[PDB]
Design a protein around this ligand. Structure first.
Ligand SMILES: [Mg+2]
Ligand SMILES: [Mg+2]
Ligand SMILES: [Mg+2]
Ligand SMILES: [Mg+2]
Ligand SMILES: [Mg+2]
Ligand SMILES: [Mg+2]
Ligand SMILES: [Mg+2]
Ligand SMILES: [Mg+2]
Ligand SMILES: [Mg+2]
Ligand SMILES: [Mg+2]
Ligand SMILES: [Mg+2]
Ligand SMILES: [Mg+2]
Ligand SMILES: [Mg+2]
Ligand SMILES: [Mg+2]
Ligand SMILES: [Mg+2]
Ligand SMILES: [Mg+2]
Ligand SMILES: [Mg+2]
Ligand SMILES: [Mg+2]
Ligand SMILES: [Mg+2]
Lengths: 95, 240, 243, 137, 95, 45
RNA sequence: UUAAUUUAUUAAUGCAAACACCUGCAUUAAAAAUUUCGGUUGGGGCGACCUCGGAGCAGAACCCAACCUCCGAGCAGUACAUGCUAAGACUUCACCAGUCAAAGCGAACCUUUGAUCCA
RNA sequence: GCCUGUUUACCAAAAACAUCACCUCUAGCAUCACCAGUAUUAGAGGCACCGCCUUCCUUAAAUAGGGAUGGCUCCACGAGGGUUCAGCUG
RNA sequence: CCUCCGCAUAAGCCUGCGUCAGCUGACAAUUAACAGCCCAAUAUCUACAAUCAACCAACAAGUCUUA
RNA sequence: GCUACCUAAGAACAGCUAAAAGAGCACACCCGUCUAUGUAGCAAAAUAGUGGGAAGAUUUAUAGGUAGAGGCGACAAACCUACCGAGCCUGGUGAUAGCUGGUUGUCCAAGAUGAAUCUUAGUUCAACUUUAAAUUUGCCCACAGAACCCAAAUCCCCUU
RNA sequence: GCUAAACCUAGCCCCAAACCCCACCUUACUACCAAACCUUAGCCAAACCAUUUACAUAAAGUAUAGGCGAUA
C-alpha cells in the first residue's frame, strides 16, 4: 500500500466537527510503499506431510507466497489460529 | 463518430465486396493517416492467402485450375480466380500464371526436394535451397503475409532442422518453421515499378491526395537534432 | 428566503419519509451510523496529544484521513480498504518546486478464494493488503464476517457478507448436503457471527436496493372491493342475527 | 540490455542510420564493450569539436580509435593551427587534414606530413594534455 | 495587511513584525541592528558594539508597527522575570 | 458574399439540436434542464 | 530556443512487487506545460554604464546634477586588548546603515564595502 | 515557374503551394485508420517534369530591354513579370 | 418595349395580392393515381463493368439472391 | 446548415475541333485577372465590361464525420456561422488595470517644486502642508569667530 | 397651441415562520418489435512570477503555517 503524508498541517477541527481541507491539503509526500517492505513469514499448522517443511501439526513459518498459493488452497495447511493450535494440541496429547 | 468498419463480412466469397473508403480517418473521425482520400470507387475481392486450404470433408495435396488472372484494384499484384473440386477462390497470381494452368497445393514434406514449378505451394521444407518464393507464412497455417507485392520474390536461403531461413525482398533474413507453406516464383505484375504515374490526376484516381500538416505536433515537422554535451556547447555553432 | 432545514439534512429528512421510512429500523440505523475506516494510506497518530518539538508544548493532534478514490472496478473485487490516492506532490519533494498531479494506484492481483460457508471458489481481484487482512482473520469467511462495511469497502464484499450471514441464520442444509456433520462443524465455527435472518436480509444493501426490496415486499395487487364489501356485509348480518 | 542501449545511443542520441549502425557494429564491435557516456562523448567530439559528419565517421571508423588518442592528435593539430573547426556555414579558411591522415596513420607520418613537427614536441604536448585532463576531472 | 479577515472579519497581525520587534507598553519599539551577526571578523570593535545594541524606533516607524500589529500585542504583560519590565514605562518625561 | 450562413434543412436541424440528440448525452440533458429552469417555451430545436 | 522551472503524462530501460500483464520507485528521453523579457544612455552601430570613494563644476558653514571633466576601490599590511563597557555627540539630506567619544573596568606602556530570510 | 491545378471567403492568384519524376530516412507486420494492405509495400522529409556534361544592338535621345554534387539544356504551358515591330485607336 | 427568361420538382417557408367588409377582421381553400410512409425469416447465392455495347479502345477496375 | 477536409450514395457538363486527352476554341456551370462604378452601397465584398477553367486534381444537391491548444489546411497563420496568431456562450467575474475618462449643495479659511525603488506614467520615507494641543523662545541680527594647499556672498548671535 | 408634461398601484425586495382524458427519449409531445461514479482550474494577491494567496460569543487574529512574505 502507498502511505502518504500531507505536506501542510491541517488545522484542528474540534471534537464533533470535521476538518476543513483546502487546495494545499491535497499535496502529499510518499512516506512509504508497503510493497517494498522486507517480506515476513506466515505461521501455519500443517495437516499433511509436505517435503522440506514438516509432517503434521507442527507450527511452521512459510513464505507467504507458498502458504497462500500451495499449502492453504490445497488443504495441506491450516491457519495457526488459537482454535487450530488448541485442536492440534488435543490431537497430539491423544497420541 | 458513428464509424463501423466495412470489413464486417464473415463468410468468404468470390463476389467483389463494396468497400468503404476511409479518408485516412480513425473510427473517431479524426485524420490518422494523411494523404488518403477520394479515388476511383473500388470493390474488394477476398483473397485466400492460405494456399493449402483443403476443401471441406477433404484433405491432402490438391490441384486447382486457374480460371483467370485478373487485375486487382486493391493490390499491386494481380490475382487469379482459381477453382478446385467444387470451390473457387482468389489467390495471388505468380509471374507466369495463365488461365487454364494447373496449380498444386500440398502439405507433404517429401524426403527429397520436390521439383519446384512456378505457382504451386509446398511447405518450405520441401523446396530446394535457393528457390524463389512468395506468399510466405510466419507460422504454420497462419496464412501468407510476406512477399505479396507485385514482382516480389524471397529466397529460401537455408534449411536446417525444422527451421528455414528466408531472405525477404527487403534483404532481411527470417526464420520460419519448415512446415509453413509458400508458393514458388515471383509475384505477378513484375513491371509495377516501371509504371509512370504521369500526372497528379492519376494519383488522385489512385486515392492519394496532397495533404499538408501531416504531423500535428507543435511546430510541425521537426528533424531530430543532436543535443550537444556541456563540453561541446562551446563549439555547437561556431560563428564564422 | 431560507430553507426550513439545512440542505445537508435533506437526505436524513427524506429517509424519515415515504418508503424509506417503512424500511426496517436496523437497516436505517446501519445507514445512519458512520464510522471512520481503518487507516490504510496514512499512519495514524499514536495518541491524542503530542509534545511538538518546536515549542515543547502539549498540543492536541487529530488524524485527518486522506481522501481515497475507489474506481467502480473495486466494487467487484476485495481491496482491503485500499484505493486510488488522487493527490499532488512537490517535484523533488521540496515545496519551492513545481506542484504536480500524482495518482497512486494499488497493485491488484487476481486470486481464487474458497468460502467455507458458501462452499464456493471465487476469483477476486485483490490487493496484498487484502491478503494480509485475510491471513490475520484466519480465512476469507472470517475476514468477510469481521470486517465492517467501511473497512471492507466493496459491494462484492458486502454481498458475500450478506450471503454468509443468511447461510448462518438459516442454517441452510444446502451447505454440503448429505454431510450434516460437516455442515454443523462449519456453522459452529462461524457461530459467533450469526444474526436474525430478518436482519441478515438487509446487510450490505445500498439505499436503492433496500428501497426496491421494500417495494417488492409491500407490493400487493389491490384486493377487489367485492371481497371487502362481502366481508363487511356478512359481518353486519351476523351482528344483526345475534342481536 | 547492453547491446540494445548501445544501439539506441547510436541511433537516437547519435543520429546514425540503421545501415550506418550495422556498419559500425560490423567493422568495430569494440563499441559494444565501450561504455555509454564515453561513446557519446567520442561521437560528439567528432561531430561538434572536430566537425565530422556521420558518413565520414563511419567511413573512417573513428569510433574504433581511443578517445585519448583522438584528443591527443586533434588538439595538437588545432593548437598548431593545421586543423580548424568548421564554422556555422561548415566552411574553413584552410581545408582540414583527412581523418585517415589524422588517426589511421602512425605517429611518424602523423607528425611528418600532417603536423610537420618534432616527436619530442609531440611527447611534451601529450604529457601536457594528460595533465590538463587530470586537472579538468 | 488584512484589515478584515475572511473568517472572522477582524484585523490581522503582520507576524514578520512580531518576529523582529519588541513593543514596550508605553509605545516604544525595540529592535536589533541589521547585520549584527554578519561578517563580524571585518567590523571594528566600535562597530560591533554599536551593532550588538537594542535600539528604539522612530515615531513613524513605531506608528507603522502599531498599525501592523493588533491590540493583543499592545497590552500589559506581567511576565515573571521580564528583563524589560523596567523599560515598559516612561519616567520624568516632559511632553 | 457573407450573411447567408443558414441554409435551412429540417433534417440537420433535428439531428443537430433536437430533443433526442439533447437527451443523448448528459451535457445535453443539462442543456434541457437549464432551459426548463429558465422557463423557456422552446426547450429544444 | 543551448532563457528559467518541472516530468505530472507517455516511451524506454533499471530496481523492487506479483509469478505476458500490472503496481511503486528511480534514470534518460520524447512530448509538452508554466513563467519572464531590469534600468540609464547610444540615429549610420557591432556598445557603455549601474556600488563606494577623491578632485573640479560647487572659490569662503553645510548642501548641491550631468550622456559633465579627471582619478581610484572591491583590499592588503599589522597586531591578536586590533578587549568590555559607557556620558555626550556627528551623520551623506528619509529609514536602513555609517562615524567619533570622556569617564570606568581589563590587558598592556592599529592605517571600503551587501540587508532580510535561509542554511 | 516544367506543365493542368491550389491559395490569403472580404486589398496579394503570384515566382508561393501542389504536381508527375527523383533522392533520403523509418518499418518484417494482420482483425477499427495505415489495411482486410505486406519492401515493386506503407509512413515521413527533401527536391522539382525531362534531357546533357562535371563595350555592342535597340531610340533622335535608352537609370529601360537584349548581347558580348555543380554547370548547362525552356518542349509546351502562363489573366505571371519585363522589352519590342506593326496596327489600332479621344 | 424588355428578359438565360419561364413552367415544374426538390429543398426551404408555412397561408404570406382568393372572397367579403372596415393594413385589420371574417370567411373560404390544397380531395390521390404523383410523392412519402415498406418488405417474415433462416441460410445458401452472386469472377465476367460502363461507354447506343456490336467491333474498336483501355485503365482509374467501376450498386449488385433463389430453396 | 458557412467554410476546410473526408465518407456514402447521386447529378451536370451545348456546339465545333479533335480522338479515348488533368487536349484546343467556346455555352451552361465554376472562378475572380484587369478596369470603371459603388464605398451607410443593390451588396457588412455588389454591379458592368473584360478575363481564367469549362470530361476533370472539375462543379454541384443530399445526409454523415472531424471541435478549440483542438479540428481541418495542394502552408495563405487559410478556414472552423459576417469581427480566428486560436471560435462562441455561460460561469469564475464587480477579473485586473501604477493607464484614460468621470466623480453631483452653499459659504469662509489655511495651503506650492531630497533618498530608495525591475524605479523615474507609480510608491514609501523625508521636506512642505493642515488641524488640535503643550510651553518658551524663534527669526532679523552687529562685534568676536569659521585653513592651509593653491568674487558676490555664506554660517554663528548680544541687542533691536 | 401642438408635442408633451404629470399621476398610483401592478407588483416587487428583505426578514420571520413553516420543510415544499390523449401524446411525449424515434425527427419529443409520434397507439402497436427481439447504459453513471473519477483532485477543479484559472482569474486574482504577492505591486512581475515560479512555492504560496485566491473555490453565536470568547479564547484569538492567539498557538501555528508561510519565496517565515504576501498572507493563511
Ligand atoms: Mg450548402
Ligand atoms: Mg541624517
Ligand atoms: Mg506555374
Ligand atoms: Mg483576397
Ligand atoms: Mg477561392
Ligand atoms: Mg485578387
Ligand atoms: Mg518605355
Ligand atoms: Mg493555370
Ligand atoms: Mg462538351
Ligand atoms: Mg481541357
Ligand atoms: Mg484546398
Ligand atoms: Mg508561408
Ligand atoms: Mg506570414
Ligand atoms: Mg465568428
Ligand atoms: Mg476596475
Ligand atoms: Mg486664502
Ligand atoms: Mg530590485
Ligand atoms: Mg508607473
Ligand atoms: Mg501578481
Amino acid at each position: 500500500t502507498v502511505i502518504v503524508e500531507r505536506w501542510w498541517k491541517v488545522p484542528l477541527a474540534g471534537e464533533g466537527r470535521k476538518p476543513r481541507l483546502h487546495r494545499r491539503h491535497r499535496v502529499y509526500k510518499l512516506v512509504e510503499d508497503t510493497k517494498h517492505r522486507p517480506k515476513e513469514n506466515l505461521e501455519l499448522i500443517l495437516t499433511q506431510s509436505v517435503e522440506n517443511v514438516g509432517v503434521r501439526g507442527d507450527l511452521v513459518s512459510v513464505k507467504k507466497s507458498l502458504g497462500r498459493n500451495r499449502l492453504l488452497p490445497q488443504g495441506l495447511a491450516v491457519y495457526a489460529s488459537p482454535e487450530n493450535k488448541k485442536l492440534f494440541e488435543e490431537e497430539k496429547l491423544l497420541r | 463518430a458513428n464509424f463501423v468498419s466495412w470489413k464486417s463480412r464473415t463468410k468468404y466469397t468470390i463476389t467483389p465486396v463494396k468497400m468503404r473508403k476511409s479518408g485516412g480517418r480513425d473510427h473517431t473521425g479524426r485524420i490518422r493517416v494523411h494523404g488518403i482520400g477520394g479515388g476511383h470507387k473500388q470493390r474488394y475481392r477476398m483473397i485466400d492467402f492460405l494456399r493449402f486450404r483443403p476443401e471441406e470433408t477433404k484433405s491432402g495435396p490438391f490441384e486447382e485450375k486457374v480460371i483467370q488472372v485478373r487485375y486487382d484494384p486493391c493490390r499491386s499484384a494481380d490475382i487469379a480466380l482459381v477453382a478446385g473440386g467444387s470451390r473457387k477462390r482468389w489467390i495471388i497470381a505468380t509471374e507466369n500464371m495463365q488461365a487454364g494452368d494447373t496449380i498444386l497445393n500440398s502439405n507433404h514434406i517429401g524426403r527429397m526436394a520436390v521439383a519446384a514449378r512456378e505457382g504451386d505451394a509446398h511447405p518450405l521444407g520441401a523446396l530446394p535451397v535457393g528457390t524463389l518464393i512468395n506468399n510466405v507464412e510466419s507460422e504454420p497455417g497462419r496464412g501468407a503475409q510476406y512477399i505479396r507485392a507485385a514482382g516480389t520474390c524471397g529466397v529460401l536461403l537455408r534449411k536446417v532442422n525444422g527451421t528455414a531461413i528466408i531472405q525477404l525482398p527487403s534483404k532481411r533474413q527470417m526464420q520460419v518453421l519448415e512446415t509453413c507453406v509458400a508458393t514458388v516464383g515471383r509475384v505477378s505484375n513484375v513491371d509495377h515499378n516501371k509504371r509512370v504515374i504521369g500526372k497528379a490526376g492519376r494519383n488522385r484516381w489512385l486515392g492519394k491526395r496532397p495533404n499538408s500538416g501531416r504531423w500535428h505536433r507543435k511546430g510541425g515537422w521537426a528533424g531530430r537534432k543532436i543535443r550537444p554535451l556541456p563540453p561541446m556547447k562551446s563549439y555547437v555553432k561556431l560563428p564564422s | 428566503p431560507l430553507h426550513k432545514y439545512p440542505v445537508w439534512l435533506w437526505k436524513r429528512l427524506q429517509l424519515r419519509e415515504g418508503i424509506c421510512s417503512r424500511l426496517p429500523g436496523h437497516y436505517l440505523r446501519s445507514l445512519e451510523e458512520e464510522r471512520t475506516p481503518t487507516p490504510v494510506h496514512y499512519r495514524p497518530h499514536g495518541a491524542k496529544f503530542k509534545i511538538n518539538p518546536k515549542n515543547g508544548q502539549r498540543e492536541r493532534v487529530e488524524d485527518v484521513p486522506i481522501p481515497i478514490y475507489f474506481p467502480p472496478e473495486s466494487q467487484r473485487g476485495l481491496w482491503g480498504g485500499e484505493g486510488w490516492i488522487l493527490g499532488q506532490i512537490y517535484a523533488n519533494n521540496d515545496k519551492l518546486s513545481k506542484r504536480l498531479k500524482k495518482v497512486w494506484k494499488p497493485q491488484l492481483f487476481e486470486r481464487e478464494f474458497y468460502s467455507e460457508i458458501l462452499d464456493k471458489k471465487f476469483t477476486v481481484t485483490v490487493t496484498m493488503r487484502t491478503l494480509d487482512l485475510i491471513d490475520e482473520a484466519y480465512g476469507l469467511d472470517f475476514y468477510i464476517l469481521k470486517t465492517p462495511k467501511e473497512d471492507l469497502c466493496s459491494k462484492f464484499g458486502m454481498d458475500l457478507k450478506r450471503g454468509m450471514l443468511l447461510r448462518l441464520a438459516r442454517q441452510d442444509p444446502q451447505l454440503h448436503p448429505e454431510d450434516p456433520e460437516r455442515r454443523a462443524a462449519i456453522y459452529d465455527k462461524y457461530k459467533e457471527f450469526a444474526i436474525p435472518e430478518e436482519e441478515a436480509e438487509w446487510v450490505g444493501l445500498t439505499l436503492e436496493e433496500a428501497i426496491e426490496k421494500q417495494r417488492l415486499l409491500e407490493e400487493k395487487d389491490p384486493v377487489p372491493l367485492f371481497k371487502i364489501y362481502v366481508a363487511e356485509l356478512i359481518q353486519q348480518l351476523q351482528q344483526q342475527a345475534l342481536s | 540490455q547492453d547491446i540494445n542501449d548501445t544501439v539506441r545511443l547510436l541511433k537516437e542520441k547519435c543520429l546514425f542510420t540503421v545501415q550506418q549502425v550495422t556498419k559500425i557494429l560490423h567493422s568495430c564491435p569494440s563499441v559494444l564493450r565501450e561504455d555509454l557516456g564515453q561513446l557519446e562523448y567520442k561521437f560528439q567530439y567528432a561531430y561538434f569539436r572536430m566537425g565530422i559528419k556521420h558518413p565520414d565517421i563511419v567511413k573512417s571508423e573513428y569510433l574504433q580509435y581511443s578517445l585519448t588518442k583522438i584528443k591527443q592528435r586533434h588538439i595538437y593539430l588545432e593548437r598548431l593551427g593545421r586543423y580548424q573547426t568548421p564554422d556555422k556555414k561548415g566552411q574553413t579558411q584552410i581545408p582540414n587534414p583527412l581523418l585517415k591522415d589524422i588517426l589511421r596513420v602512425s605517429e611518424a607520418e602523423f607528425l611528418a606530413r600532417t603536423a610537420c613537427t618534432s616527436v619530442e614536441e609531440f611527447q611534451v604536448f601529450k604529457k601536457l594534455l594528460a595533465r590538463e585532463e587530470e586537472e579538468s576531472e | 495587511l488584512t484589515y478584515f479577515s475572511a473568517r472572522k472579519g477582524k484585523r490581522k497581525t503582520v507576524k514578520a513584525v512580531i518576529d523582529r520587534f519588541l513593543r514596550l507598553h508605553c509605545g516604544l519599539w525595540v529592535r536589533r541592528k541589521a547585520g549584527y551577526k554578519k561578517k563580524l571578523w571585518k567590523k571594528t570593535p566600535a562597530r560591533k558594539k554599536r551593532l550588538r545594541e537594542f535600539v528604539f524606533c522612530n515615531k513613524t516607524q513605531s506608528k507603522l508597527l502599531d498599525k501592523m500589529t493588533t491590540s493583543f500585542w499592545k497590552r500589559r504583560n506581567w511576565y515573571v522575570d521580564d528583563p524589560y519590565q523596567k523599560y515598559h514605562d516612561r519616567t520624568n518625561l516632559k511632553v | 458574399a457573407r450573411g447567408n450562413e443558414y441554409q435551412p434543412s429540417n433534417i440537420k436541424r433535428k439531428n443537430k439540436h433536437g430533443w433526442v440528440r439533447r437527451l443523448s448525452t448528459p451535457a445535453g440533458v443539462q442543456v434541457i434542464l437549464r432551459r426548463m429552469l429558465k422557463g423557456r417555451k422552446s426547450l429544444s430545436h
